[PDB]
Design a protein around this ligand. Structure first.
Ligand SMILES: CCCCCCCC/C=C/CCCCCCCC(=O)O[C@@H](COC(=O)CCCCCCCCCCCCCCC)COP(=O)([O-])OCC[N+](C)(C)C
Ligand SMILES: CCCCCCCC/C=C\CCCCCCCC(=O)O[C@@H](COC(=O)CCCCCCCCCCCCCCC)COP(=O)([O-])OCC[N+](C)(C)C
Lengths: 50, 32
């Protein structure tokens, strides 16, 4: 749904994650590149915050 | 900020249109 899609993007941003696991290959590339996006954002945040 | 705040806005008008007009349950394979 649109709740299920929005708190995937919020869930993978605050490193906790939601249930909502993509199953098609077309949505494991959107989900798989939002995980690499929010891995670099958090790692650059917590390195500059030092 | 002038374009990409409108790209998100166009994606949000479509996402309401898919949510309201199309439900999630009965028989809707390949639908939109
Ligand atoms: C601070 C928080 C902000 C985040 C909010 C973001 C996402 C929030 C929105 C999430 C969308 C909700 C999806 C509902 C789940 C689908 C289930 C369904 O089909 O029944 C739904 C029917 O009603 C609808 O069709 C839903 C339409 C909601 C308006 C569209 C989003 C508005 C975006 C504007 C804001 C977005 C801007 C975001 C800005 C950041 C639910 O109805 P029901 O009462 O459960 O009863 C079932 C009725 N039935 C039997 C006929 C089915
Ligand atoms: C460690 C934690 C994260 C681990 C991730 C490791 C992954 C590997 C990551 C990188 C491997 C590639 C090597 C790059 C290093 C050399 C530099 C380089 O050439 O960069 C080049 C670009 O290259 C890129 O931008 C690579 C980005 C790939 C992202 C992969 C996401 C995986 C998601 C999976 C989703 C699938 C889901 C599957 C579903 C079934 C160009 O850069 P440059 O020219 O050198 O300098 C800039 C100069 N310039 C601005 C003019 C261009």
């Amino acid at each position: 749904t649109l709740l299920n899609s929005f708190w995937f993007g919020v869930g993978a941003l605050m490193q906790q994650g939601s249930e909502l696991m993509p199953k098609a290959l077309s949505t494991r590339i959107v989900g798989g590149i939002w995980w690499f996006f929010t891995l670099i954002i958090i790692s650059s945040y917590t390195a500059n915050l030092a | 900020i002038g374009v990409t705040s409108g790209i998100v806005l166009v994606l949000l008008i479509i996402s309401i249109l898919v949510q309201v007009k199309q439900p999630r349950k009965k028989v809707m394979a390949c639908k939109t």
